[PDB]
């Protein structure tokens, strides 16, 4: 079937407890298997990372993950690289908002 996976920012986490989302952000810090990410939202998000992940050496990242029931934590399923070693976060914020407004195109 494949359930749609919403593109979200940090403020939408509450709306998807227990659900698989997709989120983009700039890597702030990496502390063991935890990643701290800044969202288009301007809000930060704690991501629990898979054993194999070289996120450390990358600037912007796209995580597919499941939202955890405490607040804004996150069990990473998959992870996608971008930037350099130049994602436009404002562009991203707008796409999030616009995608939310067109469920006929981005959802069930």
């Amino acid at each position: 079937m494949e359930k749609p996976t919403p593109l979200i920012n940090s403020s939408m986490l509450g709306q998807y407890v227990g659900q698989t989302v997709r989120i983009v952000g700039k890597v702030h810090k990496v502390t063991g298997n935890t990643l701290l990410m800044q969202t288009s939202d301007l809000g930060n998000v704690e991501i629990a990372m898979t054993p194999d992940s070289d996120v450390s050496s990358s600037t912007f990242v796209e995580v597919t993950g499941k939202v955890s029931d405490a607040g804004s934590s996150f069990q990473a399923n998959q992870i996608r690289e971008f930037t350099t070693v130049d994602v436009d976060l404002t562009l991203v914020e707008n796409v999030v908002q616009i995608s939310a407004a067109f469920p006929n195109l981005f959802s069930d």
Partner: protein, 122 residues
């Protein structure tokens, strides 16, 4: 005769006026189309390469014909192709498939689909 930016969901919601006709999306013929997605599986045949492909809105098969080692799982790609039906299944028949330039293209693409949909629809 056109090249329509679309989401996999729109591909999936396109109507086929039954028999075996042209597809119709938003009251317009849906021939050639393009989209950006992540490769999730790659099955290789003698005749074709089949990719399982997913863009957060749905999943579809795109098979491209042999007559690609840069492309791997968990990678964004630009897909150009024709929508096809076999035996109640929908898949993209593709010629061109390229690793996405930068992530901004993925973003640009969602907007292009919105914009296109809006212009056929008002």
């Amino acid at each position: 005769n056109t090249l329509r930016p679309v989401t996999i969901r729109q591909i999936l919601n396109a109507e086929q006026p039954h028999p075996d006709a042209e597809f119709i999306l938003d009251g317009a013929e849906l021939g050639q189309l393009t989209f950006v997605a992540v490769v999730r599986n790659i099955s290789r045949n003698a005749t074709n390469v089949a990719y399982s492909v997913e863009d957060g809105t749905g999943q579809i098969e795109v098979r491209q014909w042999l007559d690609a080692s840069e492309i791997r799982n968990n990678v964004y790609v630009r897909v150009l192709g024709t929508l096809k039906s076999f035996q109640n299944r929908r898949s993209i028949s593709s010629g061109h498939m390229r690793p996405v330039i930068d992530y901004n293209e993925v973003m640009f693409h969602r907007l292009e689909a919105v914009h296109a949909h809006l212009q056929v629809t008002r």
